[PDB]
């Protein structure tokens, strides 16, 4: 699904995810969040299963964005873990973990959890 994953994706928050999938399983691109302490594009890197099951299963993948670029630094990183599903209604369904740099006293409240669904439209 190198061809299927590569391109521009949009989530339910209006965020924009631009990615190139390599033949080996590399994911590389940029992420632009429509919400939060973020502006403009951030580097993303990740991995995907380059030889997925051919029994109608989705393609497992994940990627990371560290929320530092030339404009801002939110001292945090989000990882998305999920699967790509092809076809007419192609989707990337994910759950994510956003961890912020904290003192040891605030480590217990360092990590947000959510879920994003990405589509080729919107």
């Amino acid at each position: 699904d190198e061809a299927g994953i590569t391109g521009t994706w949009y989530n339910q928050l209006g965020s924009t995810f631009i990615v190139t999938a390599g033949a080996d399983g590399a994911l590389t691109g940029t992420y632009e969040s429509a919400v939060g302490n973020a502006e403009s594009r951030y580097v993303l890197t990740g991995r995907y299963d380059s030889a997925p099951a051919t029994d109608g299963s989705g393609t497992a993948l994940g990627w990371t964005v560290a929320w530092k670029n030339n404009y801002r630094n939110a001292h945090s990183a989000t990882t998305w873990s999920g699967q790509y599903v092809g076809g007419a209604e192609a989707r990337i369904n994910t759950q994510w973990l956003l961890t912020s740099g904290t003192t040891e006293a605030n480590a217990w409240k360092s990590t947000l959890v959510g879920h994003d669904t990405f589509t080729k439209v919107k």
Copy 2:
């Protein structure tokens, strides 16, 4: 914390995490899991905050492993989200999401969640 993050790390399960941190915020290396449907080394890629807060806070980071290599393919990917804390007892404290490629009927049970703590010893 380019110097501090780069090197070999070990978690509570006995897994081995070897990483190089770039000046820009890149993480690159290999992961070897002591448990599960895995054998030998897998490529990992990630991001970290290359200019963290200097108020005693940890350094936010994340990385992904797709569980395909030359030996096995478990049709899944794990992302670790957490923070690096330096000093005598240097640690990377993480929470992770392991997503497997599934049919749409089994998507509800596609994602495991856990937490790993990595140290420079063990």
Copy 3:
């Protein structure tokens, strides 16, 4: 939101959630899962914020189901954590953690994570 929460709810999987909210913050009822190692109704108990913010915010709540009843025992428990939002399109948006009883060797893969959205219709 004692009145608003009390009643029958349905999620995206077709599962049925029947609950009574007490004036103090108690949640009590039964849960029927449309998927997984489950059949018929299971006891649920939980808590909700009985005096929520009046600034348009949702009402925080949570509940637990242990997957043992007279028909089956799946040796597991799911907790849903989320918020109730009233109005025309009333919803309970949740994230959940399903933990299974495991040996210490399999504890790392003991917990599934997902998200359910419940509505008054369907």
Copy 4:
């Protein structure tokens, strides 16, 4: 494990968890958090597997605390999902989800995730 679960438990943050396990699978008690927007005791309710596997597996359980009592209301609820393990070093290993009441615009950042381990000592 009705006998084993019932009593006072302490986590790594110094929080105190007092619970009575019923024969049917009920959990009832009070929770006192050593951290966060909390003071004194809060009602908790939950469920556990009252007939667990006898193959050395842990006992699945979960419970909820809504962070409202006579002293404070933090407009949030935490659910802990995990398993009880008996013996000399008896433990309750959990992962938790803390959801706060939010506006729809802030729903994406409504949920914290963490992990607590409870012991009979400390």
